[PDB]
Design a binder for these strands. Structure first.
Lengths: 196, 192
DNA sequence: TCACGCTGCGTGA
DNA sequence: TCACGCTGCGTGA
């Protein structure tokens, strides 16, 4: 595997792989937190995040999406994962939001989409978790719920194509990527011979 | 295998049975909720509760303990907290009540989780432990405002922390139950 | 379906 | 240690 604070793609998991649970996504190293949306250290940056349709805003447009941080029922602070993510934007950490001088020079963020994101996004998978590639932070800002939240614009910068495109649907088919289940999960669950 | 809304002990699960995880305690049947403290419908009663030290408002003395409900917001005798109150042998009362002949209330299987050892010597060291049948003696509200219950034990087989009970566990072979493949892959990860 | 809940765990700090 | 948290499940409704 690779270090936890490692930035960028995990070697061997191309764009379009599909795990069923987030523990498989973790063991794969693509997104190490079992539950948390963001993986980051406030002193370094954010290494990976998940879109599971948590926030009633957070508009998902494929190559572009808005995203909201962690905290709170009370105001969100620019600390921990919130601060970690903003560190990737090619701009000095500003406590009032910043924009990127050449956004493509930001730290890379791994991004996977989850079936629960379908509540708000046409780009979610029908099932499980799909690593949709690399994004960079272009902008971040605070806004009002009725409380203050920290939000982020993310643009995609990966060489391999989005899995929902024609080119990407061919990469998913040619590389033979199928929904990967935990060893034993399918076989074990098929046994519903309880009492009746 | 007795329905979900069955009162009293589960056939085949003796007092002192041990499971490492809450999921096996639901497969067992003794306590079907995976997370929730109480199993109970608001017009029938409660079937099982777990002592996992979740609330400041709790005292555990073994043969009896006092228990807390569901809720930084005032509680109500609704849903599960309504359910437990019907297990008391006295008509439901929004002001709290006590049972005359508490032993004719409806049985409640009590599971003890290791997360209660902090404030109870009677909790197990590891995992979960089925400790028999308790009945509701009395229930009342207390100050935020919360609902509390007192539960005495009414089960013929001995408690697993006594001499008689500890003798049943050794002789019945009840040892800590783990999921298949848990110990295998966790020894794997332990050595790394 | 829908929301809840005495979980349980790897990682940041 | 504790803080943290875009899990996941059965459950009543």
């Amino acid at each position: 595997i690779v270090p936890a604070n490692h930035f960028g793609p995990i070697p061997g998991v191309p764009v379009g792989t599909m795990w069923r649970f987030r523990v498989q996504v973790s063991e794969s190293g693509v997104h190490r937190p079992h539950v948390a949306g963001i993986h980051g250290r406030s002193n370094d940056g954010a290494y990976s995040l998940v879109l599971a349709g948590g926030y009633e805003d957070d508009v998902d447009n494929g190559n572009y999406f808005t995203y909201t941080g962690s905290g709170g029922s009370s105001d969100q602070k620019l600390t921990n994962n919130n601060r970690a993510l903003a560190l990737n934007c090619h701009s000095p950490i500003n406590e009032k939001g910043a924009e990127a001088e050449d956004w493509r020079q930001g730290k890379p963020v791994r991004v996977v989409r989850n079936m629960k994101g379908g509540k708000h996004s046409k780009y979610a998978p029908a099932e499980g978790n799909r690593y949709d590639g690399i994004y960079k932070v272009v902008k971040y800002w605070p806004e009002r719920s009725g409380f203050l939240v920290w939000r982020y614009l993310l643009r995609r910068d990966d060489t391999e194509p989005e899995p929902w495109t024609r080119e990407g649907k061919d990469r998913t088919r040619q590389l033979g990527l199928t929904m990967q289940y935990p060893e034993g999960y399918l076989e074990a669950l098929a046994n519903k011979e309880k009492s009746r």
